[PDB]
Amino acid sequence: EKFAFQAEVNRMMKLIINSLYKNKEIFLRELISNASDALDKIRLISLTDENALAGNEELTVKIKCDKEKNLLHVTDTGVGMTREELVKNLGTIATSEFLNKMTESTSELIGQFGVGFYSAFLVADKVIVTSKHNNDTQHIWESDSNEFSVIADPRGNTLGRGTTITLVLKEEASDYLELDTIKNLVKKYSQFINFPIYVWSSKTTVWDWELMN
Ligand SMILES: COC(=O)c1c(O)cc(O)c(Cl)c1CCc1nccn1Cc1ccc(Br)cc1
User: Where in the sequence does glycosylation occur per the annotation?
Assistant: First the structure.
């Protein structure tokens, strides 16, 4: 259940963390970007499988703040990941030219190599990935960066299909819990995205999904 990061991933996480120290906001750009990709992947799959979207009729990104529990949730209803995929796609990488371009901006570089997930550790002490893939049951990937574990989700299939990224925010990254801030940041980083992105918001005092693009 417990796993070690591959060396290159450790180096990569460091390079990422040690080059975007200034513009931390990028983590949210990249998570929204990967969320879109997940939906693309499942839409494509839906072209040749009418049963592809059975676990969830919708194709969205839902973002939820939990100021109280110090958590930020980003949930796509994309393709999701199987257990094996969690262990492989988040624990290794398929690359070393990337690690040399990185040393010699660099926010555009991680975006290009599709490896911006790890930027989440810029604002989080622990990162949790809850994922339901059509071919598998719901599993959970957790890491504080020093290792990771993948477990079967005891709650069963709550996602229907897809992925929630959950960030336990750092002391200094509390700013990103304010609904003001996240609405603002998603507005910015979600224009080019063509799936709907909602933020769970407060209107006059009620709560519902609010569309941001
Ligand atoms: C898009 O794949 C995912 O399931 C997914 C998601 O739905 C939301 C996310 O925030 C993230 Cl990070 C992912 C995984 C995408 C990812 N980032 C780094 C590695 N990976 C796995 C991966 C990379 C390339 C391909 Br092609 C497939 C999976």
Answer: 34, 135
Nearest CA to ligand 1 atom 26: 114
Within 8 A by CB and 6+ apart from 22, the residues are none
CA dihedral of residues 146, 173, 138, 112 (deg, nearest 10): -80
Experimental method used, please?
X-ray
Atom 11 in ligand 1: residue holding the nearest Cα: 34
For the chain, list the domains and their CATH numbers.
1-213 (3.30.565.10)
d(CA 45, CA 80): 12
What torsion do the CA atoms of 67, 178, 64, 127 make, to the nearest 10 degrees? -70
Give rounded-to-5 percent helix, strand, coil for the chain: 35, 25, 40
Q: How far is the CA of 89 from the centre of ligand 1 (A)?
A: 7
Pair type for strands 71-76 and 61-66 = antiparallel
